[PDB]
Design an enzyme around this catalytic site. Structure first.
Site, PDB file in Angstrom:
ATOM      1  N   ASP A   1      -0.685  -1.473  -2.179  1.00  0.00           N
ATOM      2  CA  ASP A   1      -2.093  -1.306  -1.726  1.00  0.00           C
ATOM      3  C   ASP A   1      -2.369   0.192  -1.568  1.00  0.00           C
ATOM      4  O   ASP A   1      -1.542   0.901  -0.962  1.00  0.00           O
ATOM      5  CB  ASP A   1      -2.293  -1.988  -0.379  1.00  0.00           C
TER       6      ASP A   1
ATOM      7  N   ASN B   1      -5.216  -3.362  -4.227  1.00  0.00           N
ATOM      8  CA  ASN B   1      -3.876  -3.775  -4.715  1.00  0.00           C
ATOM      9  C   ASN B   1      -3.695  -3.550  -6.222  1.00  0.00           C
ATOM     10  O   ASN B   1      -4.619  -3.814  -6.989  1.00  0.00           O
ATOM     11  CB  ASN B   1      -3.685  -5.253  -4.376  1.00  0.00           C
TER      12      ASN B   1
END
Ligand code: NA
Length: 129
Positions: free
Chosen positions: A52, A59
């Site tokens: 992330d 992501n």
């Protein structure tokens, strides 16, 4: 760059997030606080091998290319490093794609668990907007 609360509210409004897909500015500011603590350089490794990136913890499994997430997609068509810039443009553009389909802001775990259903307007209190 570590944004101040009202500084990030102002940047997100200029980049067109206030009421984007019906989500008020306070939702976005709350999501950034609990995803990244307002830090554009934040990174977090996931169990599946993805990472992330940035102020909204976007992501690499789906949204960006980091060269180390095999079999993943790049739906925002960007290197993940673009999400760590002091300039939030790339993070905002990618967040607009994420929120526009699927489960809306539920895509952000910190939003679902820490912002959804709360008084999110409090996050813009005192800000010159
Ligand atoms: Na990817």
């Amino acid at each position: 760059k570590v944004f101040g609360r009202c500084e990030l509210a102002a940047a997100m409004k200029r980049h067109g997030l206030d009421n984007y897909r019906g989500y008020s500015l306070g939702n976005w500011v709350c999501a950034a606080k609990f995803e990244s603590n307002f830090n554009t350089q934040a990174t977090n490794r996931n169990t599946d091998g993805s990472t992330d990136y940035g102020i909204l913890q976007i992501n690499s499994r789906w949204w960006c290319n980091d060269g180390r997430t095999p079999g993943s997609r790049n739906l925002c068509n960007i290197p993940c490093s673009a999400l760590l810039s002091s300039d939030i443009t790339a993070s905002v553009n990618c967040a607009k794609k994420i929120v526009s389909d699927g489960n809306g802001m539920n895509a952000w775990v910190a939003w679902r668990n820490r912002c959804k259903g709360t008084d999110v307007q409090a996050w813009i209190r005192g800000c010159r907007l």
